[PDB]
Curated annotation (Swiss-Prot), chain A:
The keyword Zinc applies. Residues 6-260 form the NR LBD domain. The chain holds residues 233 to 504 of 505 of the full protein. It comes from Homo sapiens (Human). This is Peroxisome proliferator-activated receptor gamma. Highest expression in adipose tissue. Lower in skeletal muscle, spleen, heart and liver. Also detectable in placenta, lung and ovary. One of its GO terms (biological process) is positive regulation of cholesterol efflux. The lineage of its organism: Eukaryota, Metazoa, Chordata, Craniata, Vertebrata.
């Protein structure tokens, strides 16, 4: 029980850092998506003309502008994830090269994890929740942009079925970052010791927060397999773009992450 | 309620031993040294090997690859038999049983292959031989990196230091995956896996009380498994796209496709 007390304190710490690092929480996202309120209602984009009026309501080629907007949020997300990673007990103490490595392979798995919070079966929240882009509008985009988002939705609806809240995700995200199996890690053992502590925290957290959810801990860990696959599909799709879209500029920070990924 | 979980563990272990000849315990005793097997380290040792190994498994790199296919198909039947011993599996829809096996055998083959591997090589021909890791890397493209990704996984997987009692339940968990494409009734599959996951968790806590979060660390390996599988499929295509000297007997390729 004194051991469990330390785990709860770790859970509270991570959740607190989670709230402070990420602007759009899942709680706020679900409040917008369910449309229960009258002040948090998003403008919905489902075709070209709806997108046009969206430019005035929400603060080159259509498919390109959508992609460049996603690159912006992605880079901004890397900053937020990085800020959160620093708050993880023992992360900044690790070898400097391993810190870069853990973030390199970790950011996208987390991005797609938190992207699911902004997603349902019909679409995804955009621009801090001000807008809502339908799943069909994205799927109808010009090739190969019309299938860049579909694999994310498929994972989202299955991941959201686990019904995790932000207190759960906070620890799960930390578990992803501190992976000892990341390629190029100099000192793996100190990373595994931290993840071991994070896994204990996540286990107790899910058991207390979801007592009637049998093997939720196991089910959650298995979802990390789905994350890797989506990240893998994403990189391959990007290599197709850079050859067909030679005039489209990719962000240097992202390219450094994609480099030998 | 833990009486049922221990009963499941013992049941799966017994079927595991029966369905699979060369266990990890046997493979470990062979590798370490504790009746030594023939060692294949280069081209000449390979020739003398097949002259004395007596294998049912023209070019050297191709004959090795085809040899692996023969053993894989043998393993598929051993896995299939074991899968039918898992409580509730045979009661599932027949189409789902086929689906679970079709997408599950590859993950299981590479899981149990780690039991036959160390950092230096891999046991072949049910423990009769031993092909070094370096000789496998020396094979010309693209065969030179068809076994190497499996070694890298085996090193990380064997570090968990699981035994046959652990693996028996773990294999069952892999088979009962509810996310296999084309499944018609996912509920009873995930219900069985849920029970298997509980059995595995209790098994690892009792057999390895000093290994903290071993259960979680094992589930994370599922990621590496599927990575290897998809990577293996992509390599298979390269073999099919190029390579003329892969064409076997018309009736032979049917058996091992
Ligand atoms: C892609 C995977 C590689 O192939 C394999 C597939 C399954 C297994 C395996 O052991 N799976 S298993 O799950 O442990 C079940 C089993 C155990 C023992 C015998 C048969 C089945 C091992 C290998 C390992 N390779 C061999 O055993 C092997 C390799 C080369 C030759 C060979 N033969 C003649 C000439 C050259 N090479 C023969 C066997």
């Amino acid at each position: 029980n004194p051991e469990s007390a330390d785990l709860r304190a770790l859970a509270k710490h991570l959740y607190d850092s989670y709230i402070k690092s990420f602007p759009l929480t899942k709680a706020k996202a679900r409040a917008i998506l369910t449309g229960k309120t009258t002040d948090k209602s998003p403008f919905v984009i489902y075709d070209m003309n709806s997108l046009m009026m969206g430019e005035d309501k929400i603060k080159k080629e259509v498919a390109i502008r959508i992609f460049q907007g996603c690159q912006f949020r992605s880079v901004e997300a890397v900053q937020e994830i990085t800020e959160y990673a620093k708050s993880i007990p023992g992360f900044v103490n690790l070898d400097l090269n391993d810190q870069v490595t853990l973030l390199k392979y970790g950011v996208h798995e987390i991005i797609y994890t938190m992207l699911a919070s902004l997603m349902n079966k019909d679409g995804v929240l955009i621009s801090e929740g001000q807008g809502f882009m339908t799943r069909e509008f994205l799927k109808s985009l010009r090739k190969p942009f019309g299938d860049f988002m579909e694999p994310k939705f498929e994972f989202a609806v299955k991941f959201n079925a686990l019904e995790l809240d932000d207190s759960d995700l906070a620890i799960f995200i930390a578990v992803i970052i501190l992976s000892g199996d990341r390629p190029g890690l100099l000192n793996v053992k100190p990373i595994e010791d931290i993840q071991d502590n994070l896994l204990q925290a996540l286990e107790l957290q899910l058991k207390l927060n979801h007592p009637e959810s049998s093997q939720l801990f196991a089910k959650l860990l298995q979802k990390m397999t789905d994350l890797r696959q989506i990240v893998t599909e994403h990189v391959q799709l990007l290599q197709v773009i850079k050859k067909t879209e030679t005039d489209m500029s990719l962000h240097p920070l992202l390219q450094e992450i994609y480099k030998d990924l």
